[PDB]
Ligand binder design. Sequence first.
Ligand SMILES: COc1ncnc(OC)c1C(=O)Nc1nc(C(F)(F)F)c(-c2ccnc(C(C)(C)C#N)c2)s1
Ligand SMILES: COc1ncnc(OC)c1C(=O)Nc1nc(C(F)(F)F)c(-c2ccnc(C(C)(C)C#N)c2)s1
Lengths: 71, 616
Amino acid sequence: VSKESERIWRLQRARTILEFEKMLPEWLRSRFRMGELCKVAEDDFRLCLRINEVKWTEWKTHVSFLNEDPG
Amino acid sequence: RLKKRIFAAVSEGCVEELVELLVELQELCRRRVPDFLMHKLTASDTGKTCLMKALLNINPNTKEIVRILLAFAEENDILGRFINAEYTEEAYEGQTALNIAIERRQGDIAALLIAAGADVNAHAKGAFFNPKYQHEGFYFGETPLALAACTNQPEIVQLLMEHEQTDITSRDSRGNNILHALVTVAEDFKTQNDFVKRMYDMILLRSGNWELETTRNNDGLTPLQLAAKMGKAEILKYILSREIKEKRLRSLSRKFTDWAYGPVSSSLYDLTNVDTTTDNSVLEITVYNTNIDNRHEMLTLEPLHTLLHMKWKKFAKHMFFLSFCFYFFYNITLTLVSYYRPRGWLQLLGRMFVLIWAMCISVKEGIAIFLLRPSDLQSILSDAWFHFVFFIQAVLVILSVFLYLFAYKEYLACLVLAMALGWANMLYYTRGFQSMSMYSVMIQKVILHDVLKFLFVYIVFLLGFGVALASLIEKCPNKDCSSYGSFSDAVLELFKLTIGLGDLNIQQNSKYPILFLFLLITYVILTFVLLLNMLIALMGETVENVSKESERIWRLQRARTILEFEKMLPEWLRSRFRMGELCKVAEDDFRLCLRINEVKWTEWKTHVSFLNEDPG
Ligand SMILES: COc1ncnc(OC)c1C(=O)Nc1nc(C(F)(F)F)c(-c2ccnc(C(C)(C)C#N)c2)s1
Ligand SMILES: COc1ncnc(OC)c1C(=O)Nc1nc(C(F)(F)F)c(-c2ccnc(C(C)(C)C#N)c2)s1
């Protein structure tokens, strides 16, 4: 029942987030506008969302990346 | 341009012959002294060279590419200033090609660079490698040895440690050496699978000497005190009980099993920077730091656990019982002067007792509050909170005596409040005994968490339905025509409807009686649902969680009480108690060891080692 209450809270939270995003005008929505514009290919330039993670298990040489200088 | 051409030729890696041709052309242009060559081989803005740019972009043909690059550098007497070129940007300042070859987990190329003269003592002192927040930057110790250790590369660590020019005892920007950095980097077992403990053991044995463990960073913290400060419980458990059975590296041990026969084992733990006789030991740090929430797991490690147990048995049990007895008799006298109030032979003697003891309690708990750092008050079921209620009660007592000496009538409110709060504060002492600990923590959890939330929502219900049923009731010319008359009348009737002292059938006197009874039955149903909700939350959630949470809170309060009592004693008394006896460990070691005999009846192994084989 606590799973159920937490799940209901998360679902209604997402629902009211989307409700509130619909009330704003166009300019306020464009001023919030989640997502940074990023070039991912030769000429792609698609809006992305950045997520940092730390994994201490899958040790691999890093050969796929867009920037060679992290930060 | 040739710089961009060579850079792309060395980064793409699909063409090594193209960089060979460009290097032939570079030698041709150089035929026309070293500075022009390295200005055409390193990006002037950042400082990245063809070695860095080649190692950042790894491909199956990068070993031959770096061989070609180092050959061209050696054939020009420039290898020195080329293989040890570093960044210049304030983000990766000091990063070298060895750092880049180790972060890419390139063992062959790393051995190549070290055998070609790369300074293994380079310090990546840039804002990326010394960040302020994780996930933006990565702190490893600012050294290729620390980088190879922090990223689980035991073979590169062996290669760097078997080097002669390497420096294991080198301190980075923060003063952290390899061991402070390994402590800073350790996370958990469900996150790292416990390789930092293995790297710690390896780097400590290979450099067999106390210079790494006795080094203080820019905060004065050794690796052990640093593992205590940030709650690295696995690293701390490893260090605090670390037994080297090798005959030469046994002085690096902290626990010396010298006795084991069957399931029994009498070991000798080390108490050098542990047993509360130094500036800030592992015991005091482990007990007093409230920025981790891992103390429950760290106060169970063998030396700290037995040290707290023995401090208790020796003096703190008695000091706690005397504290409890004094507070109990102070509360009894406060009760007696509250009941027998004036409405001076021995009464004033007792009042002066409670007044001087209230002043003493007030100064004590006020001192404790002054040096009471935040993050202690993070949890409500924490001992730090009690200093506040003890202070408030002592303040109420002295304020009531002040108001009684003068001609005020409100001294009785303060006196009765002080008596009630003292009897409540006895809960601090019942949380110090063991059984009463579980009982009192369960009671206080119920109250402070669930009773207060339920009481907030229930006060909302009470006030709402009291206004609703009071506005529905017609004024009438002044004996009790109604029962839900004034607002306080309605709130009282609803409250004692909840606790079972109320009747649904009263003098109506209202003009909308069906709406009145609908609202009343709605109150009853909603408050039953709320009551049963709280009751279900209690009966389900706390049958398993607070069961152990009781032991957690008891252990924390016990440790904090033991340590403050030990601080209260005079220095000669502390010197008298001072658990732990001297023991010769090596040629000249002579450390204060604590003997702990542990019988584990689930033993399947054999023991052959000793310090005094003759069982004590
Ligand atoms: C709305 O329901 C609730 N919602 C949340 N919490 C609740 O309890 C606090 C309740 C509830 O009804 N509680 C109870 N009240 C009483 C009363 F004695 F007062 F009658 C209970 C009772 C009655 C008779 N014999 C016992 C013994 C001593 C055997 C036990 N045990 C207990 S039980
Ligand atoms: C007297 O017994 C009854 N007879 C007939 N109907 C009843 O229910 C309406 C009842 C009954 O239990 N009433 C109650 N009133 C209250 C009050 F909060 F208001 F004080 C209850 C209470 C008080 C304090 N902590 C709880 C916890 C959080 C432990 C729970 N759960 C519940 S319980």
